[PDB]
């Protein structure tokens, strides 16, 4: 179940990016520049977090299945089919034991 760890790592890194960017914004409003864009590093970090997280969530999302009924009948025999549990009766050899 490594894909779970992968997703948690993506999330942690993304949160780190958000924190870094908030404090950078504070720097901006403090130095009254309000002209410049974000440093590249934050951008790359968040984007890779996003991509990795999607690649992992696709895996852990589940698993597809055929829509042809007889696929799940390939392995089956009368012994299962015949029992009819709501019509059971016990007056048979086993009661000896």
């Amino acid at each position: 179940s490594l894909w779970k760890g992968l997703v948690g790592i993506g999330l942690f890194a993304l949160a780190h990016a958000a924190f870094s960017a908030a404090q950078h914004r504070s720097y901006m409003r403090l130095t009254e520049k309000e002209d410049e864009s974000l440093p590249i590093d934050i951008v790359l970090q968040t984007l890779l977090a996003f991509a990795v997280t999607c690649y992992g969530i696709v895996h852990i999302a589940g698993e597809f299945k055929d829509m042809d009924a007889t696929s799940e009948l390939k392995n089956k025999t009368f012994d299962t089919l015949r029992n009819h549990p709501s019509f059971y009766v016990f007056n048979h050899r086993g009661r000896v034991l």
Binding site: F78, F90, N91, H92, R93, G94, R95, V96
Partner: protein
Amino acid sequence: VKLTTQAYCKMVLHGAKYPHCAVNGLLVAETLFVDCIPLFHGTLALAPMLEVALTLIDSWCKDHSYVIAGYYQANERVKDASPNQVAEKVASRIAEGFSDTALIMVDNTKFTMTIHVYEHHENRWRCRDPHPEAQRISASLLDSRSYETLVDFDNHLDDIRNDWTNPEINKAVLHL
């Protein structure tokens, strides 16, 4: 008119592995009965599988110079011992080619330490009278919890890789 230890062994084994369903099997001689076969369990009022089993066992037993000479049924309900039509038909068909084959039905109301042999002899499969170490063998192997690797014919029709002769049990009882 002899009872072979391994015959009774396989017979009651099959009777025990499917203990709530009616079963039939088949004894093969070369009267001495020499080997039991468990073939079927379930409904048993249905020809085709029966017909092909008889045919195949003929084709195979010729190779070793054996003939069948013997049937046995065991109903699902304990308190019943009566030669239902089917077994009568199959034994009249076997005695058309042997004219000495005998029918068996296990009492099954004792099922511990049983036989009810009939015989046609121009009569409608009338009864007879009782005619050991094999009993001990049966008890031991039964409590050995080994019936779970005993293959019948009905299993062979699902997974071809089995072996309805199951010589493993044969050699096993030989070691005893």
